[PDB]
């Protein structure tokens, strides 16, 4: 199932990094196999309610802890092909005092990289770029 | 079921982009078929509680990760036909220091495009336009 | 059931726009019929748990995506007959830097329209009007 | 049951407006009768799970949409008999730039009315009055 | 059970006002009796699922509406015996522009009362006092 | 079970105050005994669903009301042994206008005590210290 | 199971501190053993619903109390190998008035340590570093 999940992720373009793709495929295959095993165990008579409750609590806690990571990942997925965030573009994110200006040099799954006028590297989170006023110059 | 969902989305006007319409139709058809298959499996005696719990946890996590995307999409759906956000209109979004001014050039499902006095392109999120004071001039 | 829901909405005054009333009546009739059909299917032995879980997840996601729309609609419903927001009244919403001033020209289910001293049209969301200090002059 | 709910609301002082009291009594009687009918239907064998799920989803959505209305109503209920918010009192709500000053002229279930030095009428929400620094002069 | 709940509340010091103690005892006794009655009804065969769902929805809505009241009550309970908030003490709550200064004159279950240099009475919510920088002078 | 819970809390270092330790041990023993009694009652045939629903609603409301207290307690637990917050250290919490400066004199489970240059005592909540920029001098 | 969990945590790199690794292994082994014991008890006929409800409520309350700790831990896990946060690097976190500048001296699982121009030690939370504009110089 790992190969199937890797193929699905590669085809859909959700995940592009090979290491991240392998990790996600392993995790998804393990989760699906565990769910199938729990269903099979519950079919024959074993009470799966405590196991389901514990697994659900652990999964909810883990997903709530990784909220920012997930949000940044989704923002990076959505913003792809924006036609305004490209290499060499002079973009400006923010309005008012909280303003960020620079030239796009690289894009990541967690940060958007800009080069300032003084040569500094600016790490703008993708979630910040999503919920802000991007100014293309 | 893909054709039925595509027809429903096209008729209701919820989704207009053909690629987005096809993707949404495929996803909805797959989800409905999976729910029907799970119900059929649970009818004959298979314990579907672990599968339901896992699918619900995954769906909740995915929907919570795409919160901003969904909010922007809904805002773009609602704001359609505003009679104030039209091509060539001089609108101004915001009050105080966080102010954005320009002329509407194009509308998207994720951003509202304005042209500044200096010629810059402003990408205002639809969610920002919804919960703000739009000033038509 | 569509006619019954339309009559109920018209009598209670919750919805006034005929197009919105027809859409809401259709949606409510479809939802009630679907719930009745699911109950009937579950009576005869079909396991309705996966269908209920899927429908609940979809409904929760849709309702959470339309949070701002629902809030604005409820605010417009509540603020009706305020005796202070009337045509020709000089109202002022907000305190401090985030201040909005104008004369009320029209009311909508999504925006409150004011005319500035310079002639601009101000679109103040109803949710903003609810949770703010309205200053009648 | 409408008369019983009206008597309970009048005696407890939760609701004072006769129209609001009648509406709340009707709604509560209808809800209790519906719950009793659903329990009776489920006793004889009818699967009430889809109906319960649909009713719960609708009630949760409605209650979440009316969050601000409910909060203001509860604040108005709690603040009653404050001994500081009385007719003719010179109160001041807020600290810093977001300050509101005036003389109390009337109290409502949604707004607190103050008269400014220039004669303007200030509509301060009860929720704002609850979570703020009231300054009695 | 009303007397038992009154004794428990008085001994634990959670509630000190006799009227509030009587109201809380009545409410708790009614709730416990209702839960016992529902359990007894469900034992003999009556389907209690709709009643439980309705009661839970109503209780959740009521508890969410009284969020600020509950938070202030808990803050007043916790802050008791602070050794810094005493009669005649010159305390200062807040940092920056949102600053409040005065001498403590009285304590309530909803507000903390201070006397300003000009003689004004300041009503500082207990929740504000909890999540702020108290400056004892 | 009270002695067992007291020993566990003392060994793990979660709770250090003897009065708080005794109260927590009593509460935990009562809760565990109640859960065991409810399970035993449900084994013999008594429908425990209404009792479970009522207890869960009450516990959720209580835990949500004590959110700030719990957060401060957890922050005090985590920050222990920081090697930067010690007696006599000149620390500075905050950035910008909301800045607090002083010398650490004492630590509590609810506040962090600092002595200002003018001799005032500053009560900084532990939750504030956790989510802020501490500046050791 | 403690050794298995320790090996898993060490191999995945989620936890690096040996004391934290041992504590997490003990906690995970205890939780899994408890879930298995509850499932076994529920298989033979014992009603595990009250125990599951109590354990779930306690776990939810504990996880919600440790929200900031979990968020900081996840941020520290994610930010590892940033290639911009290294020893001796001159980084600047924040935009506007809330700005922090210094040279990285050490990294922790709860704070990021910077040395100011005046020699002060700055404790920047990892969650703050995640959701901010890092400026590498």
Residue numbers in the entry:
A (entry chain D), B (entry chain E), C (entry chain F), D (entry chain G), E (entry chain A), F (entry chain B), ...: 1 to 137
Quote what the paper states about this structure.
The full-length TcMscS, consisting of 165 amino acids, was heterologously expressed in Pichia pastoris, purified to homogeneity in glyco-diosgenin (GDN) detergents, and subjected to single-particle cryo-EM analysis. The 3D reconstruction reached an overall resolution of 3.21 Å with applied C7 symmetry. The C-terminal region, including amino acids 138–165, was not resolved in the cryo-EM density map and thus not included in the atomic model. Alignment of the conserved β domains in these structures indicates that the arrangement of TM2 and TM3 in TcMscS is similar to that in the open EcMscS channel but differs substantially from that in the closed, suggesting that the TcMscS structure may represent an open conformation and that TcMscS adopts a membrane-embedded position closer to that of the open EcMscS channel. Comparison of the pore profiles of TcMscS and closed and open EcMscS channels indicates that the transmembrane region of TcMscS has an intermediate opening, with the narrowest pore diameter of 10.8 Å at residue F64. The structures of TcMscS in detergents and in nanodiscs are essentially identical, with an RMSD of ~ 0.3 Å for all Cα atoms. Thus, this conformation is inherently favored by the purified wild-type TcMscS channel, either in detergent or lipid environment. However, a wealth of lipid-like densities is associated with the channel, evident in the cryo-EM density map of TcMscS in detergent or in lipid, which may interfere with ion conduction. Estimation of the pore radius with the inclusion of lipids in the atomic model rendered a hydrophobic region with much reduced opening, comparable to that of the closed EcMscS channel. Therefore, it appears that the resident pore lipids occlude ion conduction, and that channel activation would require departure of the pore lipids from the central ion permeation path.
